[PDB]
Paper text:
The hook, a highly flexible universal joint that connects the filament to the motor, consists of about 120 copies of a single protein, FlgE23. We examined the structures of large inserts in the [name] sequence by solving the structures of [name] from Caulobacter crescentus (C. crescentus) and [name]. We solved the structures of both FlgEcc32 and FlgEcj79 to resolutions of 1.84 Å and 2.45 Å, respectively, using X-ray crystallography. Both FlgEcc32 and FlgEcj79 contain completely different extra domains that are not present in [name] from Salmonella enterica.
Numbering used by the authors: 94 to 819
Amino acid sequence: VAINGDGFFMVSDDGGLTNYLTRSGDFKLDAYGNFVNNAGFVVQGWNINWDDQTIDSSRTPQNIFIDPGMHIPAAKSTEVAIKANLNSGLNIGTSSRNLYALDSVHGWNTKTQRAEDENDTGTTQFYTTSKNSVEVTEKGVDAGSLFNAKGQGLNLRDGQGIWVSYADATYSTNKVGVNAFDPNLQQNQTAAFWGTANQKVNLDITLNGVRIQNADIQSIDDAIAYINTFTAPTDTRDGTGVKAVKNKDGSGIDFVNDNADGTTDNMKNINLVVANTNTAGELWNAVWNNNNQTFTFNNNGNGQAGTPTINKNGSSLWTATNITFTPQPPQAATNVQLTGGLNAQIITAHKYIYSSNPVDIGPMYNPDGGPAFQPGANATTRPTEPGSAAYWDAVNGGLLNTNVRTFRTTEDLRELLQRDARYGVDYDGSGTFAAADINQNIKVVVTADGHFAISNANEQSTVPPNAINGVGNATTTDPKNMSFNITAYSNKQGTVSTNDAFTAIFKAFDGPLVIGNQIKESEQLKLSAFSAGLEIYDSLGSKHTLEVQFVKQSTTQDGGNEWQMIIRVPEPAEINTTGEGPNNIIVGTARFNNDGSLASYTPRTINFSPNNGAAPNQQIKLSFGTSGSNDGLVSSNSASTLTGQATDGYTSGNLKPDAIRVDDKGNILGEFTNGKTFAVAKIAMASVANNSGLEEIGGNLFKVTANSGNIVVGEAGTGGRGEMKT
């Protein structure tokens, strides 16, 4: 019942030629395929050409013919398109995936036993799980693109970072073991003197940049107590983070920094410098008067038994490494001389600072695997092989410093944490690096569940020959317990902001990790991810689903972002038969501009081989948008979501007769069993110059005259016409 108030006169015909006109629209399909009216007149229009599925309205109008039992063969996909958003912002909810797992060996896949760069975006490695799952592994990710378990962006910025303490910083003064002065020992003494009730000593030291001075020290407990006023900061004065306690005989001090307090350099580790004008706890000559029962004190001496000359020799009793009495103990000493310096720096904590710029932490020999250690010509010569040279540097003290550790990716940070736990901590508080400080079985990895994980297996290790300077044979090194303290990084000027979200990730490391089977893990790390299943059809019209996943790898502040695009097909189908990597998996990229528009994506086409009977090498075009536009893939600050997908392929199908209808454009719409809807025919609409000059012949039929003018045939919706209802 196709009617038209607007626009005039359908054409109608019986046999060839001889057309007629009617505004009556009571139309149906017969059992023989002809579109007719009740009078059996076949409506005139244009038929679809199935060879190109086009309707040519330019051709001469003829009988509209629609085979009722018409079968349309399946058509294979030549193109698939997607409309979707990839969240570029800081809230991704559950549209995420875990951080990729990482080896304990930098630049090396331990399972394949090959050299692979974890930070290279050109390299992508898969592994097969126990549940027969093919996952990406061994991939370092820009730390700027990290999320927590909640889907909240850590929003890490260049210059931000954290402190990681691996153990407590400790130092004991007076390691030379000179006894403390004893007022109850009624004889001359040359000892460590901390003052009496009647004699004061001068405390003069610099501790973590803070000068600690007191000339009113009358006991070691006074010194300890005064020093500990500097442990915590005041609103006007820095703290040291260093607590002091007197040793067993009260001859010296035991310092400890757990590095759990503060966010600045001055609150971490122990850097002690003693002034040469310090007298507190130094060497004094105590002379006894038997008559008066009193003591007198001097710290200079005269070069005579009981009052020997005291030569500090540019050192302090606190920090000296050697002490020498002259003459030898069989005779009373007339001179005592110290050897060493005035400072001691104990390092157990390091700062890890993020850089959005490229970072190469470099290769280093690792017993865990990879390249072998390659020594130089001798045990006193640095290696030329890069990883070996860096290993040489490490085991000779090259990491025991306060240098900034710069990282960009998760692999960078992982390996840096591992290297510092192994060679960057003064475990015995000596102020120097030795093989005793080597904790080489510490391993830092990232699990498949996205956690940083640290192990401390109770196993000895080996340092190869010619690695430690002057040591030409192998060295067995022992494991050490570790105690973690994690804080945010800042400066005293307050010009670097702290990142609580990022710091909280690694504060999960906090606590002791004793040698054994225990494992310290970080909080879970996530990535912005979005997956979609794109439907296609093979030559036989079977439906296949392209598994497409986008994971954001990096972002720039006003330069857009970049995603890894992974396409999977279930076996035995193939999309990567001739390329490297698995044959059912394609690895590509999708890059976006700062406005969220598509910049580029690759690949643009795939070569599909279903291997189910259908034809192979089915080239399928990927239509994910054009560069610079928002028509396909976009990455903007809103939830990752699929708007729609489409393909030009379809399975085989048949025409359902009773589902026929007509649009306002005169198109006869045929619905099929395959879900497709085609315009199988377009109804011709024709008008005349005059409408008042026409004759009623049949039932609402009109024939042309000389008064009407000849018939001009056109298409509804063009000119000033159109059709209605169904």
